[PDB]
Amino acid sequence: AXKXX
Amino acid sequence: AXKXX
Amino acid sequence: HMELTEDLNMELRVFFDTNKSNIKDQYKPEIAKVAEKLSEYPNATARIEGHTDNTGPRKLNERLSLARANSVKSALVNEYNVDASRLSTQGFAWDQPIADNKTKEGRAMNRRVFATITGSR
Amino acid sequence: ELTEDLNMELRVFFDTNKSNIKDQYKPEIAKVAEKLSEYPNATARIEGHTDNTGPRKLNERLSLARANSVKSALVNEYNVDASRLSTQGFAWDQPIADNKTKEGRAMNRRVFATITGSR
Ligand SMILES: [Cl-]
Numbered sequence: 468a469x470k471x472x
Numbered sequence: 473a474x475k476x477x
Numbered sequence: 478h479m480e481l482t483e484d485l486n487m488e489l490r491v492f493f494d495t496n497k498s499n500i501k502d503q504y505k506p507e508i509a510k511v512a513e514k515l516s517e518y519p520n521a522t523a524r525i526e527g528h529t530d531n532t533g534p535r536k537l538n539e540r541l542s543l544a545r546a547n548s549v550k551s552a553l554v555n556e557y558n559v560d561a562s563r564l565s566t567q568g569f570a571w572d573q574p575i576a577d578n579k580t581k582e583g584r585a586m587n588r589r590v591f592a593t594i595t596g597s598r
Numbered sequence: 599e600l601t602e603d604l605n606m607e608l609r610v611f612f613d614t615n616k617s618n619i620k621d622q623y624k625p626e627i628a629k630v631a632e633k634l635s636e637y638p639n640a641t642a643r644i645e646g647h648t649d650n651t652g653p654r655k656l657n658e659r660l661s662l663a664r665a666n667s668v669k670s671a672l673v674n675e676y677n678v679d680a681s682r683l684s685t686q687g688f689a690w691d692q693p694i695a696d697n698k699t700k701e702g703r704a705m706n707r708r709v710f711a712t713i714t715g716s717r
């Protein structure tokens with residue numbers, strides 16, 4: 468469920 | 473100047 | 478963002494009486510529509526080609542076939558204010574039959590003008 | 599006789615881990631809908647993507663959710679018939695830019711919809 472960047 | 477048919 | 482294109486393709490068929498190159502009112506509605514689509518597709522152009530059946534002098538028919546193509550162009554240019562630079566005309570005399578010249582029906586079919594409209598927007 | 603061929607390419611972009619459609623794209627989507635209404639035989643191929651960050655499974659679902667979000671707008675916000683729209687997600691398998699820069703990742707978080715059809 469948790470991407471980042 | 474003159475086709476027919 | 479988004480890209481969009483619409484390609485137009487259409488063919489008009491006009492038929493004439495023997496040794497006649499006049500546009501019969503029977504095809505005016507057909508012509509009116511071509512003009513409308515030429516308006517909807519400002520970049521659209523037309524390749525107008527006239528023909529004749531195989532009766533009569535060769536030269537008479539070469540001139541008659543062209544006269545028939547120019548008659549349809551004149552309808553678009555004069556009656557429908559279409560830009561003449563968008564319409565090309567050519568005569569093929571009796572070189573491109575679509576029907577039997579030995580029959581009355583075939584000759585009627587050969588006395589024609591075929592117009593191909595193509596364009597994009 | 600006559601025919602008219604319709605070809606469209608719609609591109610929608612998303613923020614990280616989101617599948618919501620920004621207002622800036624709404625107008626484009628309305629244009630697509632309009633054309634789909636003018637060309638009843640036209641269909642749309644909606645494909646979603648993600649950048650290379652995060653879990654594989656998450657991106658598989660997210661990319662699909664992104665294509666479906668664009669379809670949902672079309673169907674519920676623009677009266678487009680759902681039966682005429684296809685959707686699919688490709689996770690991070692089809693990048694259009696390098697994921698090593700923030701601009702490239704921005705470009706990969708998207709949905710491309712190709713509309714085709716004649717009348
Ligand atoms: Cl006829």
Ligand SMILES: [Cl-]
Pocket residue numbers: 611704705
């Ligand atoms: Cl962007």
